[PDB]
Design an enzyme around this catalytic site. Sequence first.
Site, PDB file in Angstrom:
ATOM      1  N   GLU A   1      -3.186   8.415  -1.669  1.00 25.73           N
ATOM      2  CA  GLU A   1      -4.352   8.146  -2.485  1.00 25.73           C
ATOM      3  C   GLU A   1      -4.721   9.389  -3.297  1.00 25.73           C
ATOM      4  O   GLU A   1      -5.102   9.283  -4.447  1.00 25.73           O
ATOM      5  CB  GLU A   1      -5.544   7.685  -1.655  1.00 25.73           C
TER       6      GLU A   1
ATOM      7  N   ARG B   1      -4.700   9.228  -7.493  1.00 28.72           N
ATOM      8  CA  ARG B   1      -6.012   9.390  -8.132  1.00 28.72           C
ATOM      9  C   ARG B   1      -6.270  10.806  -8.677  1.00 28.72           C
ATOM     10  O   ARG B   1      -6.572  10.990  -9.860  1.00 28.72           O
ATOM     11  CB  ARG B   1      -7.134   8.972  -7.162  1.00 28.72           C
TER      12      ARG B   1
ATOM     13  N   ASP C   1       4.303  -2.998  -2.750  1.00 30.24           N
ATOM     14  CA  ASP C   1       4.004  -3.025  -4.179  1.00 30.24           C
ATOM     15  C   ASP C   1       4.440  -1.827  -5.058  1.00 30.24           C
ATOM     16  O   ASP C   1       5.401  -1.927  -5.837  1.00 30.24           O
ATOM     17  CB  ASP C   1       2.512  -3.359  -4.423  1.00 30.24           C
TER      18      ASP C   1
ATOM     19  N   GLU D   1      -5.609  -5.654 -10.910  1.00 27.35           N
ATOM     20  CA  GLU D   1      -4.191  -5.993 -11.046  1.00 27.35           C
ATOM     21  C   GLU D   1      -3.911  -7.214 -11.926  1.00 27.35           C
ATOM     22  O   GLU D   1      -2.886  -7.262 -12.560  1.00 27.35           O
ATOM     23  CB  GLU D   1      -3.517  -6.189  -9.677  1.00 27.35           C
TER      24      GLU D   1
END
Length: 467
Positions: free
Chosen positions: A105, A109, A238, A372
């Site tokens: 993360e 980010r 994903d 998404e």
Amino acid sequence: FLPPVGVENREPADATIREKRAKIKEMMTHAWNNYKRYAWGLNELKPISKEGHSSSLFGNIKGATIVDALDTLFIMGMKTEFQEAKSWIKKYLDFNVNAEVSVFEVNIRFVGGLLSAYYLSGEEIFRKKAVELGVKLLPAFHTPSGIPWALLNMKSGIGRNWPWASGGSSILAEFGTLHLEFMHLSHLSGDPVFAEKVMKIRTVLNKLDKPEGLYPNYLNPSSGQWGQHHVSVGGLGDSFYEYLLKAWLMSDKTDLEAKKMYFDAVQAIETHLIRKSSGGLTYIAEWKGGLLEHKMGHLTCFAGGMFALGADGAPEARAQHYLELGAEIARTCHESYNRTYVKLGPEAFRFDGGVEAIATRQNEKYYILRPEVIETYMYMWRLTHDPKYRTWAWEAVEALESHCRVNGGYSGLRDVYIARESYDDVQQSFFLAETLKYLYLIFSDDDLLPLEHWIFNTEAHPFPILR
Ligand SMILES: *[C@@H]1O[C@H](CO)[C@@H](O[C@@H]2O[C@H](CO)[C@@H](O[C@@H]3O[C@H](CO[C@H]4O[C@H](CO[C@H]5O[C@H](CO)[C@@H](O)[C@H](O)[C@@H]5O)[C@@H](O)[C@H](O[C@H]5O[C@H](CO)[C@@H](O)[C@H](O)[C@@H]5O)[C@@H]4O)[C@@H](O)[C@H](O[C@H]4O[C@H](CO[C@H]5O[C@H](CO)[C@@H](O)[C@H](O)[C@@H]5O)[C@@H](O)[C@H](O)[C@@H]4O)[C@@H]3O)[C@H](O)[C@H]2NC(C)=O)[C@H](O)[C@H]1NC(C)=O
Ligand SMILES: [Ca+2]
């Protein structure tokens, strides 16, 4: 530093498109100004409570929403706001902190947000901070295999994996979604170490047999062997797939290993995981040791844009196939929005038990401001110019304004199927980084962040091609 290509936001020719784009900018001023009012410097905003929100994924690092928003502010021409954000970063963004963070993360980010801000603006502080953070993440790779730990204490350098992960294994999407950022870290720092770490991940993966061409979501960092054979193009999987395609594009098409990995992976996914419901909707199922579960996540919906983005580079006479697959995923995902009360889709939706494209479990009926589906609309609009994709994007804008906009910002919802909103009181940073950026781009001309010159990281942070 080289001047960036296509960063000017010229007004669209059509008066209605101009008005719609201006609305999205107004929605950003609402999200940003409320974050600054009640949570300045804190990672996220609680929009109902009008306080800060500190997710455990970020440990004691500060300013996630500031860093995630930098590039959206810049492309929207919000220059005063961008300068205030830059001044806070110079004084207060500190990675020398004693707590555990999600390596994944923080990479997508914070490293990604700083990289995009640098390439757009040329302000050296962003480059300096991105490299500082990269250096702090290097101990995550101190395992027998080189497959990194999930969770890292920034001060001590001590790492570990999620406690529930099969046999203490690392997660495919986590270690597989570091590539783009680490390639730019090596470019800007001149230090080969960052590229070395992500290329070692490739080496480990390519040594393994993939059962049926599929990638288990679990890989043990001590043994270098798979954990349980759970396969998904939604959560846990994903963005690993996403970054195979994007690593190839971002390398000026020189990373041939990435290209082969991508197209091999997607063919196995089509064969084993992609199905059509009796009502005619294409979906991507989850696979557990051969057994399909007929369920698709909002997270999985990113794959429509992925399939479409890879169409141009696909083998002879397969390009239309992938544009069409992208469109079918877009339609299914739009149906998951259409069949709700609020017109924003659920976290997961199913294709058995007598249902199609709706949730059944109470704990999967939520919407946390996710991008998404809109992300996939952006790619489908830019790659087809079919007006329906702008139509569907505007339906989502009207839904957000009707059901997620509150006095103190934007909130997620607990149940998209009923009339009375149940607000979750979190303004996710990815609403400012992703959901609003992709909406703004849909109602812009093609020459703002042209896809030929910019590759988006998995948190909508655009990176230039490396030659
Ligand atoms: C967003 O969501 C909306 C829902 O809000 C989606 O809209 C639905 O789309 C459906 C799919 O296209 C569509 O189903 C078709 O319906 C046709 C019949 O419609 C006409 O009759 C009905 C019924 O009237 C009688 O019954 C009612 C009670 O139910 C009484 O009140 C009446 O007095 C009558 O007795 C009317 O209600 C319709 O009128 C409404 O809907 C119209 C639009 O359809 C509006 O204009 C009207 O204003 C009004 O609101 C119509 O007059 C069927 O003929 C058609 O049947 C074919 O398809 C079947 C399904 O095929 C697939 O699945 C099967 C099963 O797995 C497979 O075998 C196939 O291979 C296919 O994969 C098939 O089984 C049949 O044999 C036929 O071939 C079909 O059922 C809905 O009508 C429609 N609902 C509404 C309210 O609009 C919308 O699609 C979503 N997406 C988007 C982008 O908007
Ligand atoms: Ca993503």
